Homo-oligomer: A and B are copies of this chain.
Amino acid sequence: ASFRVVLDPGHGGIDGGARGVTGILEKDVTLAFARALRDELQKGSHTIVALTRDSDIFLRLSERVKKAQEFDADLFISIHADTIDVHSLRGATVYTISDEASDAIAKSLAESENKVDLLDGLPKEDILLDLTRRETHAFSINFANNVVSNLSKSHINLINNPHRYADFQVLKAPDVPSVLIEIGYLSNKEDEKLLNNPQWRKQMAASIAYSIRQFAEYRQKIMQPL
């Protein structure tokens, strides 16, 4: 069966996201990275990919989640390259959702990343469900773990404690495993140099694509009892 993946290039349109010292914008880096990851996935077999946006447009976080659900996604990956409070912090990071943040950096990052909805100048927006949520979370965690493992094997630099968590609204799908990947932090000058290198970006995308293939193979082993 074809495994279904939705990629969400963070920011877009009026929301440029973080800005590097060279002028490079997060919204452009995330779209370029998403396109590279799509390409890597499409080189493989049995993965069908869609992007929340494949152009420079603004989308509310809830609309990104809705697109993943409308696609019947098996996995949702939101792609970012943010500024964080400490400029010395650098390296790939994977975040999953949690009410309680793993640490102060993660907490502050989610607070800021959730607020971008307001940039359009418009206002802010069951047991069976809770069980589904728990199952989804197990999958999100599994994927995050695998991504970190394979990035490490590929000698791609990871931040200390590279699996973190906080209350990211873009990760709220109750029924689609979801992670947010910081490919690097535009607040760090060394990460900015990696982020603007398309060959480095391709190498990271290739590692994530491998992780996705492994996750697909795992998911397809699981029973369907309904």
Contact = CB atoms under 8 A, between A and B. Distances in A.
Interface of A: 98, 127-128, 130-135, 137-139, 141-142, 145, 218, 221-226
A159 to B, nearest CB: 17
A218 B145 contact: yes
A135 B135 contact: yes
A138 B141 contact: no
A135 B131 contact: yes
Copies of this chain, tallied across the complex: 2
A59 to B, nearest CB: 26
Contacts of A137: 222-223, 225
Nearest to A144: B221
Nearest to A224: B134
Nearest to A132: B131
A223 B133 contact: yes
A130 B128 CA distance: 11
Contacts of A218: 141-142, 145
18 contacts: A127-B128, A127-B226, A130-B226, A131-B131, A131-B132, A131-B135, A133-B225, A134-B222, A134-B223, A134-B225, A134-B226, A135-B135, A137-B223, A138-B138, A138-B222, A141-B218, A141-B221, A145-B218
